[PDB]
């Protein structure tokens, strides 16, 4: 199970790139979010993550989908 | 034909509500954009405008679609 601290940190990093504050970011910024968390995903790993969280193909990731993906990863 | 001044003013008003600067706003803010231009559309007029510019139903209006709608209106 994710801890409160992890959820908070996932949220904070995500929100750094949510410039309009509506809880969504671009798939192009997912790598930046991950590196903001101190991680270093490969291009392949990011593509697999993008396939998971951008379920509908529109290039937009919302926080709830990001978080559950992060939970699976951990 | 729209003048340069009108295009510039349409762009500036639109961009007031493009908080992440990617050239799109929400349909919920279209009325605010119109009032920023000194206009006062009715609810019916806004709904007709929303039908025009949010052609795909996703609640997101981009500048090119806004501008051509504004051109038709004028
Ligand atoms: C990433 As978005 C839906 O706030 O343009
Ligand atoms: C109105 As938008 C696509 O920048 O969230
Ligand atoms: Mg998506
Ligand atoms: Mg749309
Ligand atoms: Na956003
Ligand atoms: Na925007
Ligand atoms: Zn947004
Ligand atoms: Zn979602
Ligand atoms: Zn945006
Ligand atoms: Zn468009």
Closest CA to B71 of B11, B25, B2: B2
Q: Which tokens in the block code for residue B72?
A: 């038709």
Q: Is the dihedral of CA B7, B13, B14, B18 positive or negative?
A: positive
Residues 6+ apart with CB under 8 A from B53: B27, B30, B61, B65, B66, B69
Residues 6+ apart with CB under 8 A from A74: A2, A6
Go through A23-58 and write b for each residue having 16 or more CB atoms within 10 A of its CB, e for each that does not. Answer: ebbbbebbbebbeebeeebeeeeeeebbeebbeeee
Q: Which of A16, A17, A23, A25 to mutate to test the pocket of ligand 1 (most atoms within 8 A of CB)?
A: A25
Residue numbers in A near B20 (CB within 8 A): 19-20
What single string gives the DSSP state of each residue in B28-68?
GGHHHHHHHTT----HHHHHHHHHHH-TTSSSEEEHHHHHH
Q: Which tokens in the block code for residue A65?
A: 């989908």
Q: Which tokens in the block code for residue A33?
A: 């979010």
Q: B24 has which bridge partners?
A: B62
* Shortest distance, CA A53 to any CA of chain B (angstroms): 19
Resolution for this PDB entry, in angstroms: 1.8
Q: Give the 3-state secondary structure of A42-66.
A: CHHHHHHHHHHHCCCCCCEEEHHHH
Neighbours of ion ligand 4 (CB under 5 A): B 54, 56, 58, 60
* Residue B46 buriedness (CB in 10 A; 0-12 / 13-18 / 19+): middle
The rounded distance, in Å, linking the Cα atoms of B65 and A14 is: 30
Q: Give ∠ CA B29-A66-A36 in degrees, rounded to 5.
A: 95
Closest CA to A63 of A29, B58, A74: A29
Please state the residue numbers annotated as binding site of B for Ca(2+).
Answer: 18, 20, 22, 24, 29, 54, 56, 58, 60, 65
Residue with tokens 């919302």, as numbered in its chain: A62
Question: What Rg value do the Cα atoms of chain B yield, rounded?
Answer: 11
Task: Report yes or no: B17 and B33 within 8 Å, Cβ to Cβ.
Answer: yes
Q: Which of A15, A19, A22 to mutate to test the pocket of ligand 1 (most atoms within 8 A of CB)?
A: A22
Closest CA to A49 of A70, A24, A32: A70
Q: Is the dihedral of CA A47, A6, A35, A19 positive or negative?
A: positive
């Amino acid at each position: 199970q994710l801890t409160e601290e992890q959820i908070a940190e996932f949220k904070e990093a995500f929100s750094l790139f949510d410039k309009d504050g509506d809880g969504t970011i671009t798939t192009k910024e997912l790598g930046t979010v991950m590196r903001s968390l101190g991680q270093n995903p490969t291009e392949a790993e990011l593509q697999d993550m993008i396939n998971e969280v951008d379920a509908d193909g529109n290039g937009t990731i919302d926080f709830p989908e990001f978080l559950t993906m992060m939970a699976r990863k951990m």
